[PDB]
Amino acid sequence: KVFGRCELAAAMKRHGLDNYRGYSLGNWVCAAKFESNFNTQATNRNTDGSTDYGILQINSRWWCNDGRTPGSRNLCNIPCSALLSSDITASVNCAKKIVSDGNGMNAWVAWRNRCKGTDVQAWIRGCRL
């Protein structure tokens, strides 16, 4: 599913992401925009052989099992394919674990490079929330 901007914001808000660990909703929408272009089915392979999955491009080296990343962990305890669903619940729950692990949203390279230090509230402007 390809989300609309305000549609995704409302879904993220409903799943408890707004101000989660101090990150306002705009940060999460900005990260999803530049990680996946709001597409739940996005996948991208990394040089180390791991793969990033879903709207927040969660990585198979640490967070999910895709059966082809040798010596990887499965810290969100889920198949990576579950992260590609039109229902974002699994992606959201796993993201909460990631952002809590010490490094905050810096774990998402696109957030660090394209959202951090910008007017992220602009991403939810005009939305009915």
What are the tokens at 84? 């590609």
Which member of 7, 18, 52, 66 is catalytic?
A: 52
Q: Binding partner of residue 51 among Na ion, Cl ion, none, CB under 5 to 8 Å per kind?
A: none
Q: Binding partner of residue 48 among Na ion, Cl ion, none, CB under 5 to 8 Å per kind?
A: none
The CA distance from 87 to 103, in Å, is 26
Angle at 80 between CA 78 and CA 82, to 5 degrees: 70
CB nearer to Na ion: pick between 1 and 97: 97
Chain position whose Cβ is nearest to Cl ion? 26
The CA distance from 116 to 129, in Å, is 23
In the shown chain, the binding pattern of residues 48 to 87 toward Na ion, with x for contact by CB under 5 A and - for none, equals ------------x----x---x--x-x-------------
User: What is the size of the binding site for Cl ion (CB under 5 A)?
Assistant: 11
- Residue 101 marked ligand-binding: yes
Question: Given candidates 1, 2, 24, 79, which one binds Cl ion under the rule CB under 5 A?
Answer: 24
Does position 88 bind Cl ion by CB under 5 A?
A: yes
Distance (Å) of CA 25 to CA 9, 14, 57, 110, 119: 7, 11, 17, 16, 12
Residues at the site binding Cl ion, with contacts judged by CB under 5 A: 11, 24-26, 68-69, 72, 87-88, 104, 121
Known binding-site residues for substrate equal 101
